[PDB]
Coordinates of C-alpha atoms in Angstrom, one line a residue:
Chain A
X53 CA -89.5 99.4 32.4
X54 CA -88.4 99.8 36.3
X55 CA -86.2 102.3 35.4
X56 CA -88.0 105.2 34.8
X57 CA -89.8 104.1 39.0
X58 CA -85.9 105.4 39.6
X59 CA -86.8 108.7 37.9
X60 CA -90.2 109.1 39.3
X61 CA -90.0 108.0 43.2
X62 CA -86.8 110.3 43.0
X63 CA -88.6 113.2 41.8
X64 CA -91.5 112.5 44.5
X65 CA -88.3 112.1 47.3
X66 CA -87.4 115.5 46.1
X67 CA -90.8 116.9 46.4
X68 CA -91.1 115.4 50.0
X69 CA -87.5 117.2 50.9
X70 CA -88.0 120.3 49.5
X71 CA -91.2 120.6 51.6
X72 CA -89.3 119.4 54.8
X73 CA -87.1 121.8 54.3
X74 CA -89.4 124.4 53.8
X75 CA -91.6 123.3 56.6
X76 CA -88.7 122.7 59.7
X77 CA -85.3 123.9 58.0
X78 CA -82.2 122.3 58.1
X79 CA -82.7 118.5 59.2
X80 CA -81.4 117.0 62.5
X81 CA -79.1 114.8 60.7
X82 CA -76.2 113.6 62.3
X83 CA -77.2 111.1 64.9
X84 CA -80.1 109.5 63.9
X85 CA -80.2 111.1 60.0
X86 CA -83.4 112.6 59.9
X87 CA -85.4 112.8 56.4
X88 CA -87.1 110.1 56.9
X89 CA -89.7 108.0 59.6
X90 CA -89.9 104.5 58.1
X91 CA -86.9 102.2 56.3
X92 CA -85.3 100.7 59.4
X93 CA -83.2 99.5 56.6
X94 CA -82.4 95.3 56.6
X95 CA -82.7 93.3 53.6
X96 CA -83.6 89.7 53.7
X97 CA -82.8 87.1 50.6
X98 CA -84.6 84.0 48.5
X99 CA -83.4 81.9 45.8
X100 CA -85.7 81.2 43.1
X101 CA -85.5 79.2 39.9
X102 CA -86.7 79.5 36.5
X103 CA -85.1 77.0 33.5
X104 CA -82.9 75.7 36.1
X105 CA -81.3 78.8 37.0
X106 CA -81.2 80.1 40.7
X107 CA -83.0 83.6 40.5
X108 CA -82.5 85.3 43.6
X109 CA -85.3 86.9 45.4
X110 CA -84.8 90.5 47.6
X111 CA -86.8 91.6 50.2
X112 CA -86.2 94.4 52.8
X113 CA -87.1 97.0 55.2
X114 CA -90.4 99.2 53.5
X115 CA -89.8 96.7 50.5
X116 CA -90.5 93.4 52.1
X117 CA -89.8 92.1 56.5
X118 CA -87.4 93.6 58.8
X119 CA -89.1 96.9 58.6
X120 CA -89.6 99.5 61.6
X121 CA -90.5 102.8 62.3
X122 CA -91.0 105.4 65.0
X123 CA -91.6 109.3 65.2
X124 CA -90.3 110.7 62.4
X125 CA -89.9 114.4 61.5
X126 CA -92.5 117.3 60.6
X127 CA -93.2 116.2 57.1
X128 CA -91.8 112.4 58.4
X129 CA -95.2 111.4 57.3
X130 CA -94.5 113.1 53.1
X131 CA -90.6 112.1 53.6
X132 CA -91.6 108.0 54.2
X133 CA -94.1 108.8 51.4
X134 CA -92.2 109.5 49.1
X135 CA -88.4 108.8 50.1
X136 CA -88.9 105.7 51.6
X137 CA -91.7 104.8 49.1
X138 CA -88.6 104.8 46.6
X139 CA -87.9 101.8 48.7
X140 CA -89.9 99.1 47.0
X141 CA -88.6 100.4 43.4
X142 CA -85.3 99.8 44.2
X143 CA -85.6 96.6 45.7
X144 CA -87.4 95.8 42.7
X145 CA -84.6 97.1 40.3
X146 CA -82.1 95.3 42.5
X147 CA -83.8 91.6 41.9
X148 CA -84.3 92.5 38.6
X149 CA -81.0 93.4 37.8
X150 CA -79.4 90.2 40.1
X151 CA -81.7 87.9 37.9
X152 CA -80.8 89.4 34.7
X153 CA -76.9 88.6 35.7
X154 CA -77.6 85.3 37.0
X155 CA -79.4 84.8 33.5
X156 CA -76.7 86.1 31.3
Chain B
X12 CA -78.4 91.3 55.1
X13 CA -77.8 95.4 54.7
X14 CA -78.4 97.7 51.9
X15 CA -76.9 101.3 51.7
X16 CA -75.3 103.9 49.7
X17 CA -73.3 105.9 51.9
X18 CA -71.9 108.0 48.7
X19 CA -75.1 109.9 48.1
X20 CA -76.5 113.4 48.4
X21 CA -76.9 112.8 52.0
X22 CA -80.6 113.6 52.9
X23 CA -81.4 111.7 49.4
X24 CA -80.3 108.5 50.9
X25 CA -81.3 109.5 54.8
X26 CA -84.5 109.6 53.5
X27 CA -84.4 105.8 53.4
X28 CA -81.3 104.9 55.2
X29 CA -82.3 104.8 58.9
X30 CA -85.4 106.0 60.8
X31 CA -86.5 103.0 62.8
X32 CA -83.6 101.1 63.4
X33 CA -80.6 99.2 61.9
X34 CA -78.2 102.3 62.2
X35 CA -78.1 102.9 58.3
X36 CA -76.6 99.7 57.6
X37 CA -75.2 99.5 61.1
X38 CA -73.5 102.7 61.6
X39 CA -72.3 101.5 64.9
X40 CA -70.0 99.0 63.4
X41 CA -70.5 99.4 59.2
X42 CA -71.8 102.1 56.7
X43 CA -70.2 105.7 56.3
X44 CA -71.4 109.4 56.2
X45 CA -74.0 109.6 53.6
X46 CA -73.1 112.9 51.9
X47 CA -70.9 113.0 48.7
X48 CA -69.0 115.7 47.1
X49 CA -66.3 115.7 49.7
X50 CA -64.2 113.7 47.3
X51 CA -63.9 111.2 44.4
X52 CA -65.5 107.8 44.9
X53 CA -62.6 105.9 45.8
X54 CA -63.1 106.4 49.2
X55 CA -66.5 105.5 47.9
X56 CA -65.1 102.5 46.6
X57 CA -63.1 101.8 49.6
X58 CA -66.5 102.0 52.0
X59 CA -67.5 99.6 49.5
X60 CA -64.8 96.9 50.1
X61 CA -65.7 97.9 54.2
X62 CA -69.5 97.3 53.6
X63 CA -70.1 95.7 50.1
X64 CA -67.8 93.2 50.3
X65 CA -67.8 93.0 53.9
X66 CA -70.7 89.8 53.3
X67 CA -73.4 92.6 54.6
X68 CA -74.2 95.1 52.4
X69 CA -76.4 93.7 49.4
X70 CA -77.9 96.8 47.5
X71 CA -75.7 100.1 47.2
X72 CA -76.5 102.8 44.9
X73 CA -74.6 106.0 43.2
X74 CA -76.2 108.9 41.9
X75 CA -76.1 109.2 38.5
X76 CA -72.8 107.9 38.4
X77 CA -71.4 111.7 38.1
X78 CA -68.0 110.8 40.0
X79 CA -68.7 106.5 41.2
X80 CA -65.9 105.5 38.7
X81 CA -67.7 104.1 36.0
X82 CA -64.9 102.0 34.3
X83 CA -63.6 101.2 38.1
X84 CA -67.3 99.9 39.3
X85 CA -68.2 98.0 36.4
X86 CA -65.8 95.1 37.8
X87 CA -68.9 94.5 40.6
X88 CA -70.5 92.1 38.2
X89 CA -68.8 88.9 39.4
X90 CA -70.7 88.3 42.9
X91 CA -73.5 90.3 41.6
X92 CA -75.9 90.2 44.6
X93 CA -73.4 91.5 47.6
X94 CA -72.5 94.2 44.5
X95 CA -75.8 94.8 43.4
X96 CA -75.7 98.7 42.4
X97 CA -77.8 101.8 41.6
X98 CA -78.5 104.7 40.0
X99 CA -80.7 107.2 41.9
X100 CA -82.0 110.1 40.0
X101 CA -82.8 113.6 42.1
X102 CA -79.8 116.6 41.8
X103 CA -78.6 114.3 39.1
X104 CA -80.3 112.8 36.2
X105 CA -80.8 108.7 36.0
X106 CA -79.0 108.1 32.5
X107 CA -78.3 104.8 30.8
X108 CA -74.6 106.3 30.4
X109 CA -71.9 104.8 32.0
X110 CA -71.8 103.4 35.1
X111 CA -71.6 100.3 37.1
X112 CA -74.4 97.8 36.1
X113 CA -76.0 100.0 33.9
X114 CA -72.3 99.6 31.6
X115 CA -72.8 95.9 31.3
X116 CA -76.9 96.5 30.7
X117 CA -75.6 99.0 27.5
X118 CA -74.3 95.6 26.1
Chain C
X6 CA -95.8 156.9 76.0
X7 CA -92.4 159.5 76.3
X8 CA -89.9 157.1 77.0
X9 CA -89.9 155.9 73.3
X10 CA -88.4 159.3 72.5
X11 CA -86.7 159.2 75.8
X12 CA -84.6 156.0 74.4
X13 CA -84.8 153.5 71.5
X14 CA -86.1 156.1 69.0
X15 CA -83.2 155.8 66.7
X16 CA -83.0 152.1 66.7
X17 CA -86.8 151.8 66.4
X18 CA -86.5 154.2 63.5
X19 CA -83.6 152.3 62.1
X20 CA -85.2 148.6 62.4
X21 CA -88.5 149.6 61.0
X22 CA -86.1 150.8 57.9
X23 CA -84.6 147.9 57.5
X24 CA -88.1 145.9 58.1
X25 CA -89.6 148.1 55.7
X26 CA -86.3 147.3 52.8
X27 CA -87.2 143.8 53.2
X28 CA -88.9 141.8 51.0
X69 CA -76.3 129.7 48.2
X70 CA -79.0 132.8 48.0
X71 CA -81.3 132.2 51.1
X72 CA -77.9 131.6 52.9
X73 CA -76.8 135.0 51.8
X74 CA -80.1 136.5 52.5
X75 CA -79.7 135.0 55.9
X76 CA -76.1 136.3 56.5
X77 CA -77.2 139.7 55.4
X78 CA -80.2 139.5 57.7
X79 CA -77.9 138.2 60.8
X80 CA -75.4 140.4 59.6
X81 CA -78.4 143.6 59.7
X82 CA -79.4 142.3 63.8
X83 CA -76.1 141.7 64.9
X84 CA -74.7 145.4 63.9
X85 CA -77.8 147.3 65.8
X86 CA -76.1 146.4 69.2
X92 CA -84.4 147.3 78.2
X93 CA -84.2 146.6 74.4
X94 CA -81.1 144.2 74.9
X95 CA -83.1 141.5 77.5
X96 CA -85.9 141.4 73.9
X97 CA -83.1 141.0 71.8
X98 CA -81.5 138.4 73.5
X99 CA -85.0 136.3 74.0
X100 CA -84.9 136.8 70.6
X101 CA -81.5 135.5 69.8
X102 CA -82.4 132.8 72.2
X103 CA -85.4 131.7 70.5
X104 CA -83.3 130.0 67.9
X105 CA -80.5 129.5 69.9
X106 CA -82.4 126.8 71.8
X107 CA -82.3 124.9 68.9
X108 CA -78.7 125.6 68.1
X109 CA -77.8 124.3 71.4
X110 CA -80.2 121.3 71.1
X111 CA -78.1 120.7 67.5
X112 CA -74.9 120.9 68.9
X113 CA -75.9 118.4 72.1
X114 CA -75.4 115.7 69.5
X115 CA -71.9 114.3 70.0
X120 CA -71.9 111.7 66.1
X121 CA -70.5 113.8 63.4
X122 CA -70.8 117.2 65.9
X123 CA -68.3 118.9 64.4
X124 CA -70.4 119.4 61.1
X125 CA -72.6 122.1 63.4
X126 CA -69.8 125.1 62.3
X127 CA -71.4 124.8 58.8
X128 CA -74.3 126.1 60.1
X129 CA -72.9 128.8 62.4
X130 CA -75.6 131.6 61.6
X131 CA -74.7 134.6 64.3
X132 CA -79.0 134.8 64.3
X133 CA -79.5 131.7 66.2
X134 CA -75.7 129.5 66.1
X135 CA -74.0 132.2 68.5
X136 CA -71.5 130.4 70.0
X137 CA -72.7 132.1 73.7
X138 CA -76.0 130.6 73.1
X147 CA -72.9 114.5 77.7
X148 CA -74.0 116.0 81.0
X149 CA -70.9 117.4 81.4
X150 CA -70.8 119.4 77.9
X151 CA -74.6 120.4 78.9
X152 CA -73.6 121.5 82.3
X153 CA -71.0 124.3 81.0
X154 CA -73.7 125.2 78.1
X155 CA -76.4 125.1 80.5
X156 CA -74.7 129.4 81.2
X157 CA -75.9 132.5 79.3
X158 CA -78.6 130.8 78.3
X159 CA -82.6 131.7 79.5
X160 CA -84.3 127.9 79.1
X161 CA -80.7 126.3 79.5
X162 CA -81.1 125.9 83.5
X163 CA -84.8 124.6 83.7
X164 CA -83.0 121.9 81.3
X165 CA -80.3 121.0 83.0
X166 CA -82.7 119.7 85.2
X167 CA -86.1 118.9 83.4
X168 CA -83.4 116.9 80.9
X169 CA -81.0 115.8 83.2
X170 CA -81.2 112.5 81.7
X171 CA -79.1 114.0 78.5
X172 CA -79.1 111.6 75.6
X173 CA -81.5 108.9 77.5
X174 CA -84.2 112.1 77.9
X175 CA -83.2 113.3 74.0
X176 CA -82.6 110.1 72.1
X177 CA -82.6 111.5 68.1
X178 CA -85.6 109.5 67.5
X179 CA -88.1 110.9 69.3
X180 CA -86.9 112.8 72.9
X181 CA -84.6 114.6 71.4
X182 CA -87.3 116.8 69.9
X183 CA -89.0 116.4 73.0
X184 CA -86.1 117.9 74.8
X185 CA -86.1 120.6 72.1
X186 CA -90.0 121.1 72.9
X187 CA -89.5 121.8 76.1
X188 CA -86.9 124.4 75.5
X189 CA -88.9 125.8 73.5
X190 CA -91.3 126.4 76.1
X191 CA -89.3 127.8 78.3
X192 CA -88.3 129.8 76.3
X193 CA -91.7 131.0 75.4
X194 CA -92.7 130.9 79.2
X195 CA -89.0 133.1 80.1
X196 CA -90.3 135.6 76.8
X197 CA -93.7 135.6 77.8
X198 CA -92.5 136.6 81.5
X199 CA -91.3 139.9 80.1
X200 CA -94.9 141.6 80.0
X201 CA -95.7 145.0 79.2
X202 CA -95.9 145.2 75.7
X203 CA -98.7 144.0 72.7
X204 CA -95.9 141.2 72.0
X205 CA -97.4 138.9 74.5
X206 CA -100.3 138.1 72.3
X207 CA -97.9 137.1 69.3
X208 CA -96.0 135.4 71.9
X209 CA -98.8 133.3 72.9
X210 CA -100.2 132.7 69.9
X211 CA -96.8 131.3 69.0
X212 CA -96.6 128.6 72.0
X213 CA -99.9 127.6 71.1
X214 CA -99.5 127.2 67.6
X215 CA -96.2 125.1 68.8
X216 CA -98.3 123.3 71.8
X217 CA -101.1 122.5 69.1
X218 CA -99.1 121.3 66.6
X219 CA -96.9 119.0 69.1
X220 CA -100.5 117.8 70.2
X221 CA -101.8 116.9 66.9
X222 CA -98.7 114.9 66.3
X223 CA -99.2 113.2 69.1
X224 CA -102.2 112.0 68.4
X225 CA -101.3 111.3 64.6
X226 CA -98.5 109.3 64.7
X227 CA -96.2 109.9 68.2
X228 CA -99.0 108.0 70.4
X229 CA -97.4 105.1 69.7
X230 CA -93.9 107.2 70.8
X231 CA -95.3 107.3 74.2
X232 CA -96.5 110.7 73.5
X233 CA -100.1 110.1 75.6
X234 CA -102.8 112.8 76.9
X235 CA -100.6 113.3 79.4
X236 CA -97.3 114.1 77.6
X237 CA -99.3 116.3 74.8
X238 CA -98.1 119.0 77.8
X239 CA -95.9 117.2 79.9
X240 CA -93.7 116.7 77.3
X241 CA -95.0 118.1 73.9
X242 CA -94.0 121.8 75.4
X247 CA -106.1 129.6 75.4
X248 CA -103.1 126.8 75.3
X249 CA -101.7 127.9 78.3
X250 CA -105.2 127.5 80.6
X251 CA -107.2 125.4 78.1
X252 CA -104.9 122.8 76.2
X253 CA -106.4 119.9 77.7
X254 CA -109.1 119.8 74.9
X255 CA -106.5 118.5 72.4
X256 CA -105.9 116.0 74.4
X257 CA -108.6 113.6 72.9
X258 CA -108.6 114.9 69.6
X259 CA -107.3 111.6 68.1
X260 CA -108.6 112.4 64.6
X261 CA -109.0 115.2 61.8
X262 CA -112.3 115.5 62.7
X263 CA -111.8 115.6 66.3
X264 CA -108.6 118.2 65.7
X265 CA -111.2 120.1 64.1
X266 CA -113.6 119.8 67.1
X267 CA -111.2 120.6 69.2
X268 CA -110.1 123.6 67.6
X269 CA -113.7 124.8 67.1
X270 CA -113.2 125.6 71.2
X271 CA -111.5 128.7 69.9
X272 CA -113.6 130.6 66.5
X273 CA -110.5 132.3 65.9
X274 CA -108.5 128.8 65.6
X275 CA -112.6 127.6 64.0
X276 CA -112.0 127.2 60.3
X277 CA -107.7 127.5 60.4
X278 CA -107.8 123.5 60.2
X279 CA -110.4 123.7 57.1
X280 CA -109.8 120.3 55.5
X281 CA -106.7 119.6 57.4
X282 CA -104.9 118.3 54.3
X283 CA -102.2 121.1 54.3
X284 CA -100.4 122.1 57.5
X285 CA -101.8 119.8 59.9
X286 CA -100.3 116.6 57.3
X287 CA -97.1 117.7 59.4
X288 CA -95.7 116.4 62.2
X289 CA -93.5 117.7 65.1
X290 CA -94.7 121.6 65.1
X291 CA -95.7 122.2 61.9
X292 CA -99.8 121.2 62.3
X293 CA -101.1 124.8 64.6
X294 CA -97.5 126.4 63.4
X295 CA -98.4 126.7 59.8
X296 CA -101.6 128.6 60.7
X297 CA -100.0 131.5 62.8
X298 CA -97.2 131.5 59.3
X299 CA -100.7 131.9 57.2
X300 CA -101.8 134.1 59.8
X301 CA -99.0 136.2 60.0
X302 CA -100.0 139.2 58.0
X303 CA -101.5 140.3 61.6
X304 CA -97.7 140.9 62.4
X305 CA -97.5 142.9 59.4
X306 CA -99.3 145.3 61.0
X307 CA -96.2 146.6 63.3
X308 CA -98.4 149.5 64.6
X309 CA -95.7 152.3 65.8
X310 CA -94.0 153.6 68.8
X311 CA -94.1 149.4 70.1
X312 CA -91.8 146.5 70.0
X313 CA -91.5 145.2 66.6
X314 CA -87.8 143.8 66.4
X315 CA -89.6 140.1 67.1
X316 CA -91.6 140.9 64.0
X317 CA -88.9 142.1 62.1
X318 CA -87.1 139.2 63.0
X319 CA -89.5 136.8 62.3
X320 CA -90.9 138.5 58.8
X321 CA -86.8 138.3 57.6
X322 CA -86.8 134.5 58.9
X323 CA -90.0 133.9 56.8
X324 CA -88.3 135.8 53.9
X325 CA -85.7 133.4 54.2
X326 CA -87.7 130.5 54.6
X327 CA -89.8 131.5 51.4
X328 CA -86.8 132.5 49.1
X329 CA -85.1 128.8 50.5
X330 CA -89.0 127.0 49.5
X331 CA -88.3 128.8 46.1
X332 CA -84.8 127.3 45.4
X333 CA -84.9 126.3 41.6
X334 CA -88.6 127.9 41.1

């Protein structure tokens, strides 16, 4: 079912870019990356357990704790809205897909 | 712990790599140049043994899988969560073809 | 009034021919266009303002360096030229209009244009420099697109800071000390903390009353994309190009919207 969040939140994430590029160019890049204002990127763990079995539990920047921001770029506001809003779907893909190992 | 692709269309992953802090990964001392297509994976691989399996990286993610070495990345399944990969859509299409994790989920 | 046909005439002629033509694509169209300026070499000082205009932000691009080396990718002739890390900025601080008002306004290098945040204030105030070195060079109906330009870029800076960048240190104060009728009457904008005040502020001015409208589009940007996107709306006032005046700036700014469209329509 969280797949298809990997389909749409990209599609949005493409949306924001193409309008960041439209709006201010090529991005800065390089030093600090650009393309985005939030997802000070740090992921923090937990360990469940369901039947016995040690489910692990993902949390991270924009998804969860260790988050941060500051400034951003012209359409920084669209580019966390939508790039960095990918964020929460793919930290929930990545518990479910460590649970779904531990369970097999 | 850290979470980063570093094999990616560049701006695709800068988009949630690093804005407020943590480098990316830690740039400064992990991580690796976010934009693909200037070779084959193994190097992706490779950044993957220096930041997957360097006991930081948790999440990493390949796009589509159009060049991450399907057969090659499917061997991340023992220690699942500092291996635990992706498969972001945008400039190539999210597919339940073959790939890393998405290989064993076939099964 | 006789000096046109004294000099210029035949590049006049030639650049409204070429503006008048006009209509890995964008980057071709952008060659082309670059290619179009560069071969046309009192006209020169306009032309190289012009060149400057982007060049700023070349310059500002290259500062970084950090994977510097990938700026030869983006090597446009328009606004890459290579003519146009204290030590680096010292030598580039030459042939360059706003480069020696930086060398000392941003004499702090990387600690006064940090990637975050001051290094697009850095670039904010070379940019108005360069509008103040552009707008220095009176005589001509450019100056009111010139203006309108810096305050478009001082508005939208402004609105920013108020949005978001407050927290970025970007106060009252720095929506001019820092964040590049603007030039005697921006201090309005420095209160207008909301939509609603952006709007209020801008009523100041009935030519800028109504440009916000809902302020959902435009404005939604940061950095200078809020008061910028209304003089690209409002543009079609530089389509006039009424004769026998300096149009190259609006030629080079309709071909640089051209390319900016075509690059917005990438794969429809």
């Amino acid at each position: 079912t969280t797949k298809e969040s990997m389909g749409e939140v990209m599609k949005d994430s493409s949306f924001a870019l193409i309008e960041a590029k439209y709006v201010a160019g090529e991005n800065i890049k390089h030093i600090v990356l650009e393309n985005v204002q939030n997802a000070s990127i740090k992921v923090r763990s937990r360990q469940e357990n369901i039947a016995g079995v040690k489910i692990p539990k993902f949390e991270y920047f924009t998804d969860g704790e260790t988050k941060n921001d500051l400034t951003g770029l012209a359409r920084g506001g669209q580019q966390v809205q939508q790039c960095r809003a990918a964020y929460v779907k793919a930290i929930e893909l990545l518990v479910e897909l460590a649970s779904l190992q531990t369970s097999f | 712990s850290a979470l980063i692709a570093m094999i990616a269309d560049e701006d695709t992953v800068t988009g949630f790599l690093l804005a407020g802090v943590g480098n990316v990964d830690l740039r400064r001392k992990t991580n690796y140049l976010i934009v693909d297509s200037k070779t084959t994976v193994k190097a992706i691989e490779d950044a993957f043994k220096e930041f997957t399996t360097k006991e930081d990286i948790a999440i990493v993610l390949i796009s589509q899988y159009v060049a991450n070495m399907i057969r090659f990345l499917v061997d991340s399944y023992n220690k699942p969560i500092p291996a635990i990969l992706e498969i972001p859509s945008k400039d190539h299409p999210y597919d339940p073809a073959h790939d890393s994790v998405l290989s064993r989920v076939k099964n | 009034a006789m000096t046109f046909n004294i000099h210029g005439g035949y590049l006049e002629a030639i650049v409204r021919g070429y503006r008048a033509g006009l209509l890995t694509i964008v980057e071709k169209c952008t060659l082309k266009l670059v290619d179009e300026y560069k071969h046309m070499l009192p006209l020169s000082t306009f032309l190289e303002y012009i060149t400057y205009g982007h060049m700023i932000d070349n310059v500002v691009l290259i500062v970084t360096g950090r994977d510097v080396q990938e700026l030869l990718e983006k090597c446009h002739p328009l606004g890459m030229f290579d003519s146009i890390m204290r030590e680096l900025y010292r030598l580039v601080l030459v042939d360059t209009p706003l480069a020696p008002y930086f060398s000392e306004c941003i004499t702090s290098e990387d600690l006064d244009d940090m990637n975050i945040e001051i290094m697009r204030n850095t670039l904010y105030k070379a940019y108005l420099e360069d509008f103040y070195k552009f707008c220095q060079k009176l005589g001509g109906a450019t100056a009111e697109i010139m203006s309108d330009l810096l305050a478009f870029e001082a508005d939208r800076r402004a609105v920013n800071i108020t949005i978001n960048s407050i927290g970025t240190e970007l106060t009252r104060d720095d929506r001019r000390k820092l964040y590049s009728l603007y030039p005697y009457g921006h201090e309005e904008l420095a209160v207008c903390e909301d939509i609603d005040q952006v709007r209020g502020v801008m009523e100041k001015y009935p030519p800028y009353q109504s440009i916000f409208s809902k302020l959902s589009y435009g404005e939604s940007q940061m950095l200078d994309k809020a008061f910028y996107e209304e003089e690209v709306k409002r543009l079609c006032l530089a389509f006039e190009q009424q004769f026998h005046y300096g149009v190259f700036f609006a030629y080079m700014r309709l071909r640089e919207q051209e390319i900016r469209n075509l690059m917005w329509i990438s794969e429809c």
